[PDB]
């Protein structure tokens, strides 16, 4: 399964008439392009080594499309102020998600387009890419305005044509980097916890892609209801980390085994504390 997304954000700030506009491109969750209006020279830039394959004309046009986006987000933010009868003394946020998933069959699986106001659902394009979903009464004004204008037709054309097209391109170009795995470098550590109880940390480091699964076992039974599991975190080098800990009775640690599941791991790993 493969995807491309564009996460967009405009933030109106107290006093500044211009909103800050930030646009990030993702290809299979990997950031590949970025645009921040707060940069000294706001232009779309490569964020993945395979994007270097694109020429000045690609970057020139993207940047121009972005300045056009900047203006769309500003007026929208202004129109949104009136809909919810808000005072123009504070800051507000208008976010957008758009893109396309591809199935195991590199054919299209689904189009995506959804908006938000103040971090809350506003309006979204239905999967049929024809009808709109509003979240509240204010949204309905955009719904009725958009249904008429044929907006959905335009978004459909992008989400079924250009989204697909360039994703297929990015997938061929960034193949060597995108379809790679780094299997985890798991290990178990040992620490105190309470009176006559130690804790067992099962780490998994330096792994790509982000998806992973860590399990703990007592007497051949998974310890689901008794397991401290941190959310997955980036290392800052493109790989990811996760650990999982249980609280075990002291002197009975060897009873416990840690298991790791990753798509770069043909056989899942099995680990235990090593005194």
């Amino acid at each position: 399964p493969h995807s491309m997304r564009y996460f967009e954000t405009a933030v109106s700030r107290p006093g500044l008439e211009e909103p800050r506009y930030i646009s990030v491109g993702y290809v299979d969750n990997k950031e590949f392009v970025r645009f921040d209006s707060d940069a000294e020279n706001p232009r779309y830039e490569p964020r993945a080594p395979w994007m270097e394959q694109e020429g000045p004309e690609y970057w020139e046009r993207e940047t121009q499309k972005a300045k056009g986006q900047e203006q769309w987000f500003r007026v929208s933010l202004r129109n949104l102020l009136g809909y919810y009868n808000q005072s123009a003394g504070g800051s507000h946020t208008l976010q957008q998600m758009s893109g396309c998933d591809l199935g195991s069959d590199w054919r299209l699986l689904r189009g995506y387009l959804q908006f938000a106001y103040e971090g809350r659902d506003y309006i979204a394009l239905n999967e049929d890419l024809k009808t709109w979903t509003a979240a509240d009464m204010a949204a309905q004004i955009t719904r009725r305005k958009w249904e008429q204008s044929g907006a959905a037709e335009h978004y459909k054309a992008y989400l079924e044509g250009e989204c697909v097209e360039w994703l297929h391109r990015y997938l061929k170009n960034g193949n060597a980097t995108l379809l790679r795995t780094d299997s985890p470098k798991a290990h178990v550590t040992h620490h105190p916890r309470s009176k006559g109880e130690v804790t067992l940390r099962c780490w998994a480091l330096g792994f790509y892609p982000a998806d992973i699964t860590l399990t703990w076992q007592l007497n051949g039974e998974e310890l689901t209801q008794d397991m401290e599991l941190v959310e997955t975190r980036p290392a800052g080098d493109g790989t990811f980390q996760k650990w999982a800990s249980v609280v075990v009775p002291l002197g009975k640690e060897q009873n416990y085994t840690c298991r790791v599941y990753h798509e770069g791991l043909p056989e899942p790993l099995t680990l235990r504390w090593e005194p």
Binding site: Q69, W146, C163
Partner: peptide
């Protein structure tokens, strides 16, 4: 490739 919004909110 980036997308451009056709109609205002």
């Amino acid at each position: 490739l980036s997308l451009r919004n056709p109609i205002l909110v």
